[PDB]
Amino acid sequence: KTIKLWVPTGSKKSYADTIAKFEKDSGYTVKVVESEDPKAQEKIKKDASTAADVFSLPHDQLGQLVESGTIQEVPEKYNKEIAATSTDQALIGAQYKGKTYAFPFGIESQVLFYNKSKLAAEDVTSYDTITTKATFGGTFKQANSYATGPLFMSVGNTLFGENGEDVKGTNWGNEKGAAVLKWIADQASNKGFVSLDANNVISKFGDGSVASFESGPWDYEAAQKAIGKENLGVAIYPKVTIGGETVQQKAFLGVKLYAVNQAPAKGDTKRIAASYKLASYLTNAESQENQFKTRNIVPANKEVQSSEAVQSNELAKTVITMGSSSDYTVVMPKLSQMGTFWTESAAILSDAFNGKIKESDYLTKLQQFDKDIAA
């Protein structure tokens, strides 16, 4: 009566109390092993004997694990609990073709970081205002698709249709997509836009040549240190004016999941039930509260999201606003054709900024993109 759990690196101690509570309530023992979330899929394929009963993963890999038969639909009991307690965006993270396969525990989104000695709060709600009054820095020469890929969805185009599950639904090859490429190209002559490399985002923020930039919670500490805690502002993504339309700038949402792999239980339904119970425990309000407090995990649970501790933390509050609605975030699609998206979107965004494609080529390149990705 032992089940194996894979938890994110560093996290084991954070979860000790949660696990003890589960152990005391279920009478199962839990073997807890740290293991990198992004590698869970590879690890399972390589050695299914050693595979954990319960493991953390990023939702962007959930579609693959479903399609290989590794993760099965959760029991209806848990489906109801997850839908009730999670944000709608988090649930979309946990679902694939209409079924729930995992338990959200966390969310992540990029935000706008700015220097309060260079920009007032009032002036960071609009990209046009930011670059009129100060500077915005981005890595446009070597485009980051995670960062600026969502511009295409910001203007009302989709990545694999509205639900992110139609392999033929990506529709950038139109005037709105072309207008995204135009805006990219225009940033080269926008006097408030500063062309960055990955390795100088933070240092140019520190030296004051970049007043603002977009990144995730992983850069929060470095931003703080670059200009001083008291000078660091955090805000939601601004509006941006593309093709003469002012629209909300979107980012991707990442949803952090626990899932159950039934295979190591070999038909033992008592143990499978225990595995779902563990996942439920790991991702309930109490655990998410503890995970925010100990490891600054931004909760997927609506109730913890609105807690004073979380709402008083400007980074967490901002990530939550971004994850609160599809007005701000696109939940990263799960289809394997995302592979093409990463490669081709980066190249086209780069080429538009660098002038390796011209305006008269924007539409044909985007139409070709739409064809390529639909394979």
Author numbering: 39 to 413
What do the study's own words say?
The crystal structure of SPs0871 in the absence of a ligand was determined at 2.20 Å. Three aromatic residues critical for ligand binding (Y184, W256, and W380) lined one side of the binding pocket, similar to the structure of other maltodextrin-binding proteins. The 6 of 16 residues in MalE1 that were identified in previous studies as being involved in ligand interactions are conserved in SPs0871. Given that other maltodextrin-binding proteins have been reported to adopt a closed conformation upon sugar binding, SPs0871 is likely to undergo a similar conformational change. Maltodextrin-binding proteins are thought to exist in the unbound conformation without ligands, and ligand binding drives the protein into the sugar-bound form. We first performed virtual screening for the two-state conformation of SPs0871. Using both conformations allowed us to assess whether potential ligands induce conformational changes in SPs0871 upon binding. Virtual screening with the two conformations followed by in vitro screening yielded a hit compound (95,186) that competed with the ligand and was derived from the hit library for the unbound form. Therefore, it is likely that 95,186 favorably binds to the unbound form. When we performed additional docking calculations using the Glide docking program (Schrodinger, New York, NY, USA) to identify hotspot residues for the compound binding, E146 and K294 were predicted to form hydrogen bonds and W256 was predicted to form van der Waals interactions during compound binding.
